Structures are given as C-alpha cells and as structure tokens.
Amino acid sequence: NLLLAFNLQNALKVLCHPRLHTPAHTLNSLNAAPAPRDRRETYSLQHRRP
C-alpha cells in the first residue's frame, strides 16, 4: 500500500522507442487491406512546381 508515482518519466521506457515512430507496418497493413476508402481527396497532397 505504498503510494507509487507514475508520471511521464516512467512512460519514456516505451514512448521513446523507434517502433512508435515508424509508420511502416501501419502502411503495409493499409496496403494489405481488402478495402480502401471510396471518397478520395486530391487538393493539397503534393506541391506542383510552377
């Protein structure tokens, strides 16, 4: 019944890992998805050089 203190300092043992800053498995699981979205957007994706 000790009053332990979980601040953000302990959560750095997880949050500061590169597995939380990669999109790679997220991206290929979206690429392996059987259904992508129908309502596509095109307005401000990539910049055309004039």
Partner: protein
C-alpha cells in the same frame, strides 16, 4: 521503482548519514554510549544474516 532514493545525504557509499553511524568511521568513538542508528548502517549487522 520510479526514483533512486529520497535522502541523497544519507544513502550513499560514504555520506553524512554514513559517517555519523558507520563503525568504519567511528574509530575515535567511545565504546560506551548507545545510538539509535547503529543497527541501521553497520554493514556487519546487515550482512551477517
């Protein structure tokens, strides 16, 4: 598990809370008088068991 110690003046290998109450630094001490902390920092008391 979230912090080392609360008293960094009494819980190091040699410090204030050690030098008053280590028998390794109480060489010039008298052999008579009792103190409360002598069972709290004597290394031969905590390691013989």
């Amino acid at each position: 598990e979230y912090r080392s110690t609360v008293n960094p003046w009494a819980s190091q290998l040699g410090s204030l809370g050690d030098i008053m109450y280590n028998s390794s630094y109480r060489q010039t001490a008298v052999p008579g008088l009792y103190s409360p902390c002598r069972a709290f920092f004597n290394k031969e008391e905590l390691l013989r068991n």
